[PDB]
Design a protein around this nucleic acid. Structure first.
Ligand SMILES: *C(=N)c1ncn(CC(=O)n2cc3cc(-c4ccccc4C(F)(F)F)cnc3c2)n1
Ligand SMILES: *C(=N)c1ncn(CC(=O)n2cc3cc(-c4ccccc4C(F)(F)F)cnc3c2)n1
Lengths: 707, 707
DNA sequence: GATAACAATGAGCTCATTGTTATC
DNA sequence: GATAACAATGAGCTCATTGTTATC
């Protein structure tokens, strides 16, 4: 065959072809597992072929693209499968079965689904043949019993409860985490680790087409929404069987990947952050990150403490995106950058490696994400360890301020940038009880004009003034247009003899082109008014697909920035009520604690209560009989009054007694002051504290750019 | 020209060729800097060409290798340089000058030296031409003043002292850490950032040849030793000049790289670890690492806390090497492994990515590297932050136990594996005052035989028994022979028709080959006794180049394991004396502190000393007048008796007073017991505590392998 | 004579999924 | 009907230096 990375079976193509099998390995980890496993069986009858990335989607793919596909052509040649032929069986194939050994995660499900879509689309009569298609399943968590899915381990862990302490848990998350002993064990018990997809009814083809057809996007939207809106009716897939159905496989395993794709691509409507960005922000807050550290070190910290399950390179890219601030990017970045994080020249693609760029938290990160609100959000628990919250609750809607664009499965978003000051003013208007003024997208550092061509369709026109010498000077490019891309466009246009010459004086922050064209062409353009039209100085901004996650976790669509603002306003008012209640409770507890401390210190110094040479039980009994309030048999009493008898001897002094009394009175006064403030007042105070800081940030950045 | 990545100057090859310049960029970071810098000058007259890695060494390189060198051929074609021609000037060259823009670190010096060696070797008359060769120098630390070398910043920082608090320091360590503003400034002030090598006398060629000649290895040994054995006569190179000399450049800049290469390749003779391994071990100890974590997370932690200046991939490889335990590897690994860390199949090369392998500290790591000794070692300070010690001091010589092999510049080592038990027995023999028995290399899990051929030249032979059926079964391979390598050797030998057939039953831990050869060939081999000779079952172990760093930091050579053992014994006896003295001092201070605490508590309870409602100054004055010993004006007195008045009110109870008295007596008795023990007794106790653990470790690993 | 094995260093390059919207 | 671009993901692979010492 000559395929570079094919371990073709020795008995492939002969009288034993229908007894052979091909393993569509998902890289090199599965191949390492196979090297040790297949030796424990009839290796002459087993083939292996790794897959580089995610296979091609051959439904929407053109004939040219499919033919120019090394992976697809290689697998077809190995299996002896021809597009033109119509195989009713494995008679003409070089193999009798085709097994897919991918990871036991969402991307493994996607790879299996893509292979199934390939086979079904081109040879639909081969999926109907029992046993032709197969999957290899491996455990992900072991308690040496083996669990093939995370929920089962959680279900088993919950059922066992305190009995898990006697069990040692090993997590085989990636498919490369298993060595040779695991490979031998798995391939000895092949029946337990080999399920063959079975075609029962006509709904299997319908499910495959729906999952992998370009015309069934709305059916996928319904798929994901119905899955996410079920009350325990998810019906997770079990692996104790060996006759997985195609429709069952789709609806129970591919839906998990599609939901995960939507979750990681679509941003929350409250904090505006995706789960990875939220993990980075949460880790940065946990560190109290205020001094720049290498982005790679931050990525390692996030992986260790935020339970990030993906590779560092993705984490580095996420941090870089969080820190970038060029035009067409974050309006108010939450991470400060120190290095080459990318510029408008290449649209943020021209950034140094993570080993060269440093980052920290911006001075305004904690004026938007208030520290107090860290006490009222709900925190996820990914395998016991506490992890990022379900969503942060900033002072202003950061989904609108920073803008986002992501592609899920069934859903995709595009949220432009809006002025933080316009948003703050609208929030104050709502707080006062007024109405909301319309908001159009706003990008910082953009000297052009953004006009609303239609509802949710704006046009940003990069400014270019025609100098009175036959040349045209381009000073600002439209949003989303990069200086190198414009240089390429100008070179291509000159190759067509449309511009005589052009000179570039572009800094990494400002754009300056000078284009000289034929005088006749320039005059015609000026007369027709298409100077900016023909120079690509108008680009679109689409606000017609504002798709996000509401607080309940459902993917919703918003008509424009006003709907987002109103929903955020309601959720944020509720959470400000929660924060005020939490602060009131904490202050009340602190005041009670300090009142008890002052009473104890007075009763000790005054001699009414004596502690010197007192048995622990007797002293605690006396303290209880005196009515002192506990503030966590023998252990319970010791922990209750650890704050009364755990106070250093410094506190039994005139100066320290006076300081403690002052502390109690300060706590009481602060509680009284807080009891007279409503959530609207707290929100207004936060907004008035945040607005001047945003104004100063914009002024400082403008001065830096002008310098 | 058609060179893929050449930004050839527009005026190259014309009447202005001698005014052009070529920048031999060291990759993509320097190219990013150039894109922004060269635009601030006559870009028509400047070319750029990145270099992938370290250039070729064209002295020892054969003609075939040099010709088959895209980099060298590319640069020669770009410059219009032909090997055959003898250029006396830049008249026939397409450029007038050749500038090298590499990082301002040791590897940048190596790249510049390699380019100079190229030019000198092939066209020696071009280095004599003033201004042909040039370098571009950039700052590494800035205090916005710019420093071009780390010592200058340290010298400036020391000179300033407390005045550095008003300065903000930015570290441009890598050459990709500088963006466009830095590039613009550097290429505006080109004279300050462009030094041209000048050829003054005949010593310049001698220095270049010595540094880059295959026969000047001993001259390089003398170079490094003389550099390392100078008392402030290093004469660090300064960049305030613009006429760097070739000999001066070599002896002041390339020597730094050579010394760094030797430092990072040669292991210390005390702890047996190289600086990177020492940093990993130190970071693991700092974490108190006892639960497995991803190797990538460990690498990030080491980079953040051990001031590791290199990339992660190197750190991942170092951790993997520290954890590996296959035959021909660590006898007693200091890091426990959980995953695929590599096997004897590929000699440790078949290990999973750092994202899939977990590691922690082995149960015996802290029985060799005793925690107490952590208090008596000297800790480095790399830019203020405290870093790994100059060397750890284990209980046994881990340089001998684990074996090492590294290549420096001028020096190279090869230390085999010796039995930890033989080493322990020899250490006990020395402690008793006896002599040392000879030691031959020992590898765990090796069933072959290691016999000393000459002084320091051992031969390891794996076991292969000629079964009584015309076939030979190989059950062990010689140290350093990998199962896949042996499979390749057997396939190649069969291709020559020497073995009729062979079958492999090799597990990732044990070897089992069965080779059937022609009966005549087998009979002839048996008669001649060359069965193992012809099957590559004998291999060499060279103990004739045991090169290490003694405690003083000088590279020394040791005749055999006995010299290493004796030197380690002396240093370790000194350090055990240091540890006993430190422990005695700490125990004495603790006993004094606790006796003072008991006196204070007794005085307080008995009423002799009253603290209730006492001014801070008066109480501290009374405590001082009562003779209480401080144990860190107003601040000094407050900190001295923070341990007295900082006692909790718990301590003023019968039970807690009795517990404190018991603690004081326990401390006093422990000090008395320690005062009667000599350093030899402490070392003997440590060795007797370590030996059974090593025996149990070997037994457990043997059982695991057998299973 | 010239390779070959050994370890600590070093970075860009490769392209498919998924949905919207506009050109083409 | 066929491309283009947008972002979150995914891993192998390429080869030089430096010194020793055996075998081709
Ligand atoms: C047909 N035209 C076809 N079939 C399958 N494919 C995909 C393909 O050829 N291919 C996917 C990848 C992915 C990478 C890559 C790039 C960056 C990061 C990671 C990776 C990955 F390998 F891990 F996936 C590189 N090359 C290819 C080739 N096309
Ligand atoms: C002549 N035959 C010649 N001149 C220069 N070179 C070196 C060369 O062609 N080359 C070195 C490298 C290094 C890598 C690599 C591999 C792993 C990690 C990092 C790197 C590095 F790029 F960063 F250096 C890859 N390709 C080459 C090519 N030969």
């Amino acid at each position: 065959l000559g395929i570079p990375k094919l371990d073709d079976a020795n008995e492939a193509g002969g009288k034993y072809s229908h007894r052979c099998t091909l393993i569509l390995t998902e890289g090199d980890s599965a191949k390492a597992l196979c090297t040790a496993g297949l030796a424990v069986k009839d290796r002459d009858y087993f083939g292996v072929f790794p897959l580089r990335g995610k296979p091609l989607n051959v439904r929407d793919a053109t004939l040219k693209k499919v033919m120019a596909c090394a992976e697809f052509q290689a697998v077809s040649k190995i299996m002896g499968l021809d597009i033109r032929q119509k195989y009713s069986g494995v008679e003409r194939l070089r193999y009798g079965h085709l097994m897919i050994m991918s990871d036991q995660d969402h991307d493994g499900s996607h790879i299996k689904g893509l292979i199934i879509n390939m086979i079904h689309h081109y040879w639909p009569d081969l999926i109907k043949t029992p046993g032709f298609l197969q999957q290899f399943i491996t455990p992900i968590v072991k308690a040496r019993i083996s669990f093939f899915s995370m929920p089962d381990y959680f279900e088993w862990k919950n059922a066992i409860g305190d009995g898990i302490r006697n069990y040692e848990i090993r997590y085989y998350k990636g498919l490369g985490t298993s060595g040779a002993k695991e490979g031998r064990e798995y391939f000895e018990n092949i029946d337990r680790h080999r399920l063959d997809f079975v075609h029962e009814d006509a709904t299997d083809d319908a499910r495959i087409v729906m999952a992998f057809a370009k015309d069934k996007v709305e059916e996928r939207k319904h798929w994901i929404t119905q899955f996410k809106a079920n009350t325990n009716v998810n019906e997770s897939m079990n692996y104790n069987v060996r006759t997985v159905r195609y429709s069952e496989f789709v609806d129970k395993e591919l839906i998990l990947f599609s939901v995960a794709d939507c979750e990681r691509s679509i941003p929350s409507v409250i904090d505006g952050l995706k789960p990875g960005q939220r993990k980075i922000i949460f880790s940065s807050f946990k560190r109290r990150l205020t001094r720049s550290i290498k982005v790679v070190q931050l990525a390692g910290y996030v992986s260790e403490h935020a339970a990030y399950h993906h590779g560092e390179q993705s984490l580095v890219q996420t941090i870089v995106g969080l820190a970038q601030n060029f035009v067409g990017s974050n309006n108010v970045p939450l991470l400060q950058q120190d290095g080459q994080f990318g510029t408008r020249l290449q649209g943020g693609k021209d950034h140094a490696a993570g080993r060269y760029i440093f980052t920290r938290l911006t001075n305004i990160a904690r004026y938007i994400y208030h520290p107090s609100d860290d006490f009222v959000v709900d925190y996820k628990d990914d395998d016991g360890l506490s992890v990022e919250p379900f969503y942060y609750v900033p002072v202003i809607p950061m989904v609108l301020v920073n803008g986002t664009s992501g592609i899920g499965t069934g859903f995709a978003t595009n949220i432009p940038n809006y002025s933080p000051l316009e948003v703050i003013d609208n929030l104050m208007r709502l707080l006062r009880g007024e109405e909301v003024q319309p908001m159009k997208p706003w990008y910082f550092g953009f000297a052009g004009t953004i006009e609303e061509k239609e509802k949710g369709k704006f046009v940003s026109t990069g400014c270019a003034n025609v100098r009175p010498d036959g040349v045209v000077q381009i000073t600002e490019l439209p949003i989303g247009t990069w200086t190198q891309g414009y240089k390429k466009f100008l070179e291509e246009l000159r190759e067509k003899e449309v511009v005589v010459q052009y000179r570039e004086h572009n800094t990494d922050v400002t754009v300056d082109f000078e284009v000289f064209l034929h005088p006749e062409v320039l005059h015609h353009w000026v007369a027709q008014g298409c100077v900016e039209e023909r120079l690509q100085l108008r680009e679109y901004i689409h606000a017609t697909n504002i798709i996000a996650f509401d607080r309940e976790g459902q993917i919703t669509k918003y008509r424009d920035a006003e709907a987002v603002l109103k929903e955020f306003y309601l959720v944020r008012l509720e959470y400000y009520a929660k924060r005020r209640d939490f602060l009131i409770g904490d202050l009340r507890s602190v005041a009670s604690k300090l009142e008890n401390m002052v009473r104890f210190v007075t009763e000790v110094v005054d001699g009414r209560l004596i502690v010197t040479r007192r048995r622990k039980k007797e002293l605690l009994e006396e303290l209880r009989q005196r009515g002192y309030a506990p503030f966590p048999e023998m252990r319970r009493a010791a922990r209750d009054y650890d704050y009364l008898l755990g106070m250093r001897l410094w506190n039994l002094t005139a100066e320290m007694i006076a300081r403690l009394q002052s502390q109690l009175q300060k706590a009481r006064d602060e509680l009284a002051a807080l009891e007279k403030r409503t959530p609207k007042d707290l929100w207004a105070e936060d907004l008035n504290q945040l607005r001047p800081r945003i104004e100063n940030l914009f002024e400082e950045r403008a001065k830096e750019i002008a310098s």
